Amino acid sequence: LEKESSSVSSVFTVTGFNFAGRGQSSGMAFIMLKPWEERPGGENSVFELA
Amino acid sequence: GDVSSAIQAQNVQISSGQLGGLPAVKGQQLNATIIGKTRLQTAEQFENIL
């Protein structure tokens, strides 16, 4: 969120119900981003941003 | 009828909660489901339910 605020925007986080299973040893996050214009080619693509 | 109420008594999987459930005390670091006893299986186990 701070080491990468060019592409990434909000970052809804969750602990408990990721996409895999449950158990306390699970969590995930919904990585919302900024529009397409606001991200210059390359290091701003999700393929690169990730 | 003493047998029926009895059979029921000594043959019922008990839920048995969790070892670190929620809420929890600060820390713990370890959470693990607790698996209790299972229902009868063998003819012998049934010949045993006093």
- Coil, strand, or helix at residue A35? coil
In angstroms, the CA A32 to CA A5 distance is 11
Q: Which residues contact A11 (CB under 8 A, 6 or more apart)?
A: A1, A29, A30, A31, A32
Which residues between 1 and 40 in chain B have a beta carbon less than 8 angstroms from any beta carbon of chain A? 20, 22, 31
In angstroms, the CA B50 to CA A9 distance is 66
Task: Mark B24-38 as b/e (b = at least 16 C-beta within 10 Å).
Answer: eeeeeeeeeeeeeee
Which residues between 12 and 41 in chain A have a beta carbon less than 8 angstroms from any beta carbon of chain B? 23-25
Q: How many CA atoms lie within 13 A of B18 on its CB side?
A: 12
**What's the gap in Å between the CA of B29 and the closest CA on chain A?**
11
Q: Where are the alpha helices (H) located in chain A, listed in sequence order?
A: 46-49
Contacts B31 to A, Cβ<8 Å: 23-25
**Which residue is closest to B21 within chain A, CA to CA?**
A24
**Which of A17, A24, A25 should be substituted to probe chain B, the one whose Cβ sees the most B Cβ atoms within 10 Å?**
A24
